[PDB]
Amino acid sequence: QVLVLDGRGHLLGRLAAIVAKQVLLGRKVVVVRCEGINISGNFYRNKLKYLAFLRKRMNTNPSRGPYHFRAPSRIFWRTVRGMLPHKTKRGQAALDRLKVFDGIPPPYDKKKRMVVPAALKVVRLKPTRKFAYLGRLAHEVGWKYQAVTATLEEKRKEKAKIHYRKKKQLMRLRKQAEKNVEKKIDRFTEVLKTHGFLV
Amino acid sequence: VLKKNPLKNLRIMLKLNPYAKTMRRNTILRQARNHKLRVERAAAALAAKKS
Amino acid sequence: EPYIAWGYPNLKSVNELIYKRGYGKINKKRIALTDNALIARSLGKYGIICMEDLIH
Amino acid sequence: PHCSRNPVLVRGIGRYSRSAMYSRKALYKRKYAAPVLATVTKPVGGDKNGGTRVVKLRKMPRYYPTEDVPRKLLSHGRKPFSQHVRKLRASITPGTILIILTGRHRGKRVVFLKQLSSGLLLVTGPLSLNRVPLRRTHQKFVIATSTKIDISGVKIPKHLTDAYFKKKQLRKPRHQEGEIFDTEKEKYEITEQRKVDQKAVDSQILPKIKAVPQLQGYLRSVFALTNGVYPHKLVF
Amino acid sequence: SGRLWCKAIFAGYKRGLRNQREHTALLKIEGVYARDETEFYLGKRCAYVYKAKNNTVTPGGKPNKTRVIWGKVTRAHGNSGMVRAKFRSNLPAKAIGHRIRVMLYPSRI
RNA sequence: CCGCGGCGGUGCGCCGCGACCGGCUCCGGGACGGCUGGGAAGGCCCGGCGGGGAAGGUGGCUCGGCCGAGUGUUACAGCCCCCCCGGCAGCAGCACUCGCCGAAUCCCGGGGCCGAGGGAGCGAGACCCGUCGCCGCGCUCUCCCCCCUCCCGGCGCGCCGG
RNA sequence: CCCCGGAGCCCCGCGGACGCUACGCCGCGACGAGUAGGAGGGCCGCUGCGGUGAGCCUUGAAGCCUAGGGCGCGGGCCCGGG
RNA sequence: GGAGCCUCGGUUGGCCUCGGAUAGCCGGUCCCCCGCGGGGUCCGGUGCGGAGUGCCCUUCGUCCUGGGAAACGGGGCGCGGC
Ligand SMILES: [Mg+2]
Ligand SMILES: [Mg+2]
Ligand SMILES: [Mg+2]
């Protein structure tokens, strides 16, 4: 009943657009590995664009004024917040469904997570165009926890590589098992390829 | 009076113009006739293909 | 010109307009041509005695 | 009392003409050269002294109401339900299979037997298999699956009709007021004729269904929409 | 013994940008996204089904807390397989982004 | 009191169906006209007449196992293409959807939606009612016959007589 | 080739609505922004007078109040309870 | 274990490599190196991806008895240790 979307390889606003409408239709969404979101346009371009946003502050009392979140998760949240009617009750309710993470923490680090191919960089950009990793961007504008988020993700990838190896090992045995058994599953296996699987 | 649309309501068309009946009796028959004759061409073409 | 679209109607157009939306002016009351008794009553002094005559 | 000498071409258009019909009907040769006060209308009876008495059948009334509604306007083409024409989805043919969508027998699978007079379907998901007796349903609340048993030569009872498959109980007065009267009665009892009808019909079907492998097991099962499967995508 | 209704979300009312026309719901039927995939669903019965404090009656059942507003999918709304509905009362707005059940049962199948 | 007979208005509350008409929006079929009396195409092939790319060719070189692959040159036709003369039915605005405009040269069937809005009977021994216009028909008061066969009747599921 | 105190009626000229407060009732079409301004209608509203309701009222008037029931497009109004 | 106000949404699950994109996925190594795995080469398969989210898993009536194929699997909110 819940989207989990690996924000890696996606485009910041392009993903946010799609997430907003999901969120407005009552879909609970989770967006994970937000540092891996990447924004079209060469790096420097986007840094300035952020740095400008930093300059925007309520002169008389900055403490009130537009809160510039550094973490890539909160950045991505900010851009999704910009596509909902978030002053309404229904808008605020909508955001409460969305759940964003720098990196990929423990509920979702053992969940299969989708990819919006309509927000994906490999598709939506020309290959000769330039872009920025929202991590780097976040890092240079003051995000504290890049390295921590990297050191925790190397653990995760090592932990996962193990799971995949065991998964592969079952798949392989299952391929062997069928071959071991294929005269006493033969007139089942035949019927599952008259109606068109197994081919 | 309610305006029944002649072009949908056969009998209203006939009320306003009775020659419609015939015009539409023709052009059912005419079209059937020709539809039959197309099948007959198609059967002869299949027979010519078989030969 | 820039207030109208116009041109040369088909036969079918004259039929479809007259049958689907044919309304007489009969004592200055827009009245739908439900029967030829209406057309005749008004235009029968010209030899026009039915919807068909009108169309012609 | 001959039938219709011109056939139908289209609803409202006969095949022939006026002129062909004159010749067919032969209007030539079928030419028909043809150039109260005292007496009381409709009363009359008997009786003893004085003489006989003149009654009056349908005697003028003993109360008029103060105001009453005034007629209608004839209205042309407004038949009562009985005189209606009955449709049927081409999908639903005899000995086809349905998925009954609405009632208590909901999602249950079934065999279609006939369209009754009403326009309702008669149905049986052979009581034995499914727990669905001889039963009426509507076309409109039923999905005509593309799965048929060959039911051609089974003699469904003539006596089973709309009129029989029709609810029964409850009359007007009785004790009425208190804490009684037809809140009880309680149960629709099945009756024996009903059980006999079922027994007869099912036996003719039941062998026929079985001939098709797994079909009984299919007819045991219940239909329901799971995840990822959308009515509009799948076929039945 | 399972689900005999296709899922759908109440998108919101038929509306222009700045005039919402509350008497017509819009319905995002799950799994259908083309003014093409949606001739199945035209004229199907549909239920906004919700529960409330006080008890109610229930057809062929004992008194319940669930209530429904019945309606009917009328026509297809714009290319991407949204659908228009119309309900025997207008839908609450409380209802936005919640389930309404599109049945199968005025079937033409 | 039982008839829910005939007519009239009604439904306590929530429901559903059905068919008829109006107005819509779609879907599926078919049948026609016109054109540069469409353009291209296909299919059968035959006889010629040239021109071009560029070839089962040849040749320099290169790359692989005389053969295969890659460039390069003069260019006939043993890969094709193009023009020109002359001639076949298979065409048909072609489900081989390559490019139109249409319909007295046009019809049929089907689905979704919204709506029904009016009320030409207030007689005392004889209707509490039809219906006007249009469609035809259908029927009959005219005879024939043929078929199928539903009810009923007869004879041996079959045959014979509403 | 006859009479409606009886043709039986889709038209009836012998008598005529359920309808006809003729300032009534009914039918067909069309149309409907509005300041200043103009005109019409208000069985809208206030107070007093002539008439009139064999009106109402201590078995409860006027006023007052009311998450009660309704009517009217509306000015307003009528009922219930206090 | 029993009742009993209230607030609601729901109406099978999916228990995961990393990543690439002018490339990838799986095998198996005969052979070599590193800590049953990891890395390499070589070879054999897939590649509009069927070791496919266009996917997979799961079944959705209850029971009875009396055969076959499949057969030691499931349970007791079974119980203790790692
Ligand atoms: Mg005005
Ligand atoms: Mg003014
Ligand atoms: Mg529930």
CSV table of N, CA and C (backbone and C1' of nucleotides) in Angstrom, one decimal, chain F residues 62-87:
chain,number,residue,atom,x,y,z
F,62,U,P,48.4,-4.6,-48.9
F,62,U,O5',47.1,-4.4,-48.0
F,62,U,C5',47.0,-3.4,-47.0
F,62,U,C4',45.7,-3.3,-46.3
F,62,U,C3',45.3,-4.5,-45.4
F,62,U,O3',46.0,-4.6,-44.2
F,62,U,C1',43.4,-3.9,-46.7
F,63,C,P,46.3,-6.0,-43.5
F,63,C,O5',44.8,-6.5,-43.1
F,63,C,C5',44.1,-5.9,-42.1
F,63,C,C4',42.7,-6.5,-41.9
F,63,C,C3',42.7,-8.0,-41.6
F,63,C,O3',43.0,-8.2,-40.2
F,63,C,C1',41.0,-7.5,-43.2
F,64,G,P,43.5,-9.7,-39.7
F,64,G,O5',42.4,-10.6,-40.4
F,64,G,C5',42.3,-12.0,-39.9
F,64,G,C4',40.9,-12.5,-40.2
F,64,G,C3',40.8,-14.0,-40.6
F,64,G,O3',40.8,-14.8,-39.5
F,64,G,C1',39.6,-12.7,-42.1
F,65,G,P,41.7,-16.1,-39.4
F,65,G,O5',41.0,-17.2,-40.3
F,65,G,C5',39.8,-17.9,-39.9
F,65,G,C4',39.1,-18.5,-41.0
F,65,G,C3',39.8,-19.7,-41.7
F,65,G,O3',39.5,-20.9,-40.9
F,65,G,C1',39.0,-18.3,-43.4
F,66,C,P,41.9,-17.3,-57.9
F,66,C,O5',41.0,-18.1,-56.9
F,66,C,C5',40.5,-19.5,-57.3
F,66,C,C4',39.9,-20.2,-56.2
F,66,C,C3',38.8,-19.4,-55.4
F,66,C,O3',37.5,-19.5,-56.1
F,66,C,C1',40.2,-20.5,-53.9
F,67,C,P,36.5,-18.2,-55.9
F,67,C,O5',36.1,-18.3,-54.4
F,67,C,C5',35.0,-19.2,-54.0
F,67,C,C4',34.8,-19.1,-52.5
F,67,C,C3',34.3,-17.8,-51.9
F,67,C,O3',32.9,-17.6,-52.1
F,67,C,C1',36.1,-18.5,-50.5
F,68,G,P,32.3,-16.1,-52.2
F,68,G,O5',32.5,-15.6,-50.7
F,68,G,C5',31.6,-15.9,-49.7
F,68,G,C4',32.0,-15.2,-48.4
F,68,G,C3',31.9,-13.7,-48.3
F,68,G,O3',30.6,-13.2,-48.1
F,68,G,C1',33.9,-14.5,-47.3
F,69,A,P,30.3,-11.7,-48.6
F,69,A,O5',31.2,-10.8,-47.7
F,69,A,C5',30.9,-10.5,-46.4
F,69,A,C4',32.0,-9.6,-45.7
F,69,A,C3',32.2,-8.2,-46.2
F,69,A,O3',31.2,-7.3,-45.8
F,69,A,C1',34.3,-9.2,-45.8
F,70,G,P,30.9,-6.0,-46.7
F,70,G,O5',32.3,-5.2,-46.6
F,70,G,C5',32.6,-4.5,-45.4
F,70,G,C4',33.9,-3.7,-45.6
F,70,G,C3',33.9,-2.6,-46.6
F,70,G,O3',33.1,-1.5,-46.3
F,70,G,C1',36.0,-3.7,-46.6
F,71,U,P,32.5,-0.5,-47.4
F,71,U,O5',33.7,-0.2,-48.4
F,71,U,C5',33.9,1.0,-49.1
F,71,U,C4',35.4,1.4,-49.0
F,71,U,C3',35.9,2.2,-50.3
F,71,U,O3',35.6,3.6,-50.3
F,71,U,C1',37.4,0.5,-49.7
F,72,G,P,35.1,4.2,-51.7
F,72,G,O5',36.3,3.7,-52.7
F,72,G,C5',37.5,4.4,-52.8
F,72,G,C4',38.3,4.0,-54.0
F,72,G,C3',37.7,4.2,-55.4
F,72,G,O3',37.7,5.6,-55.8
F,72,G,C1',38.8,2.1,-55.4
F,73,U,P,36.6,6.0,-57.0
F,73,U,O5',37.1,5.2,-58.2
F,73,U,C5',38.2,5.7,-59.1
F,73,U,C4',38.5,4.8,-60.2
F,73,U,C3',37.6,4.8,-61.4
F,73,U,O3',37.9,6.0,-62.3
F,73,U,C1',38.2,2.6,-61.0
F,74,U,P,36.9,6.4,-63.4
F,74,U,O5',36.9,5.3,-64.5
F,74,U,C5',36.6,5.5,-65.9
F,74,U,C4',36.4,4.2,-66.6
F,74,U,C3',34.9,4.1,-67.2
F,74,U,O3',34.7,4.8,-68.4
F,74,U,C1',35.7,2.0,-66.3
F,75,A,P,33.2,5.3,-68.9
F,75,A,O5',32.3,4.4,-68.0
F,75,A,C5',30.9,4.1,-68.4
F,75,A,C4',30.7,2.6,-68.6
F,75,A,C3',29.4,2.0,-68.0
F,75,A,O3',28.3,1.9,-69.0
F,75,A,C1',31.2,1.0,-67.0
F,76,C,P,26.9,1.3,-68.6
F,76,C,O5',26.8,0.0,-69.4
F,76,C,C5',27.1,-0.1,-70.8
F,76,C,C4',27.1,-1.5,-71.4
F,76,C,C3',26.0,-2.4,-71.0
F,76,C,O3',24.8,-2.3,-71.8
F,76,C,C1',28.0,-3.5,-70.7
F,77,A,P,23.4,-2.7,-71.2
F,77,A,O5',23.6,-4.0,-70.5
F,77,A,C5',23.4,-5.3,-71.1
F,77,A,C4',23.4,-6.5,-70.1
F,77,A,C3',22.1,-6.8,-69.4
F,77,A,O3',21.6,-8.2,-69.4
F,77,A,C1',23.7,-6.3,-67.8
F,78,G,P,22.5,-9.4,-68.9
F,78,G,O5',22.4,-9.3,-67.3
F,78,G,C5',21.4,-9.9,-66.5
F,78,G,C4',22.0,-11.2,-65.8
F,78,G,C3',22.7,-11.0,-64.4
F,78,G,O3',22.0,-11.2,-63.2
F,78,G,C1',24.2,-12.0,-66.0
F,79,C,P,21.2,-10.1,-62.4
F,79,C,O5',22.2,-9.7,-61.2
F,79,C,C5',22.0,-10.1,-59.8
F,79,C,C4',21.5,-8.9,-58.9
F,79,C,C3',20.2,-8.3,-59.2
F,79,C,O3',19.0,-9.1,-59.0
F,79,C,C1',21.8,-6.6,-58.6
F,80,C,P,17.7,-8.7,-59.7
F,80,C,O5',17.9,-7.1,-60.1
F,80,C,C5',16.8,-6.2,-60.2
F,80,C,C4',17.1,-4.9,-59.5
F,80,C,C3',16.4,-3.7,-60.1
F,80,C,O3',15.0,-3.7,-59.7
F,80,C,C1',18.6,-3.1,-59.8
F,81,C,P,13.9,-3.1,-60.7
F,81,C,O5',14.3,-1.6,-60.9
F,81,C,C5',14.3,-0.7,-59.7
F,81,C,C4',15.0,0.6,-60.0
F,81,C,C3',14.4,1.4,-61.1
F,81,C,O3',13.2,2.1,-60.7
F,81,C,C1',16.8,1.5,-61.3
F,82,C,P,11.9,2.2,-61.7
F,82,C,O5',12.4,3.4,-62.7
F,82,C,C5',12.8,4.6,-62.1
F,82,C,C4',13.3,5.5,-63.3
F,82,C,C3',12.5,5.5,-64.6
F,82,C,O3',11.3,6.2,-64.5
F,82,C,C1',14.8,5.3,-65.0
F,83,C,P,10.0,5.8,-65.4
F,83,C,O5',10.4,6.4,-66.8
F,83,C,C5',10.6,7.8,-67.0
F,83,C,C4',11.3,8.1,-68.3
F,83,C,C3',10.6,7.6,-69.5
F,83,C,O3',9.5,8.5,-69.9
F,83,C,C1',12.9,7.1,-69.7
F,84,C,P,8.1,8.0,-70.4
F,84,C,O5',8.5,7.5,-71.9
F,84,C,C5',8.8,8.4,-72.9
F,84,C,C4',9.4,7.7,-74.1
F,84,C,C3',8.5,6.7,-74.8
F,84,C,O3',7.7,7.4,-75.8
F,84,C,C1',10.5,5.6,-74.4
F,85,C,P,6.1,7.4,-75.7
F,85,C,O5',5.7,6.0,-76.2
F,85,C,C5',5.1,5.7,-77.4
F,85,C,C4',5.9,4.6,-78.2
F,85,C,C3',5.1,3.3,-78.6
F,85,C,O3',4.4,3.4,-79.8
F,85,C,C1',7.2,2.8,-77.7
F,86,G,P,2.8,3.1,-79.8
F,86,G,O5',2.7,1.6,-80.2
F,86,G,C5',3.4,0.6,-79.5
F,86,G,C4',2.5,-0.7,-79.3
F,86,G,C3',1.1,-0.5,-78.8
F,86,G,O3',0.3,-1.7,-79.2
F,86,G,C1',2.2,-1.7,-77.2
F,87,G,P,-1.3,-1.8,-79.1
F,87,G,O5',-1.5,-3.2,-78.3
F,87,G,C5',-0.8,-3.6,-77.2
F,87,G,C4',-1.5,-4.5,-76.3
F,87,G,C3',-2.8,-4.0,-75.6
F,87,G,O3',-3.7,-5.1,-75.5
F,87,G,C1',-1.3,-4.7,-74.0
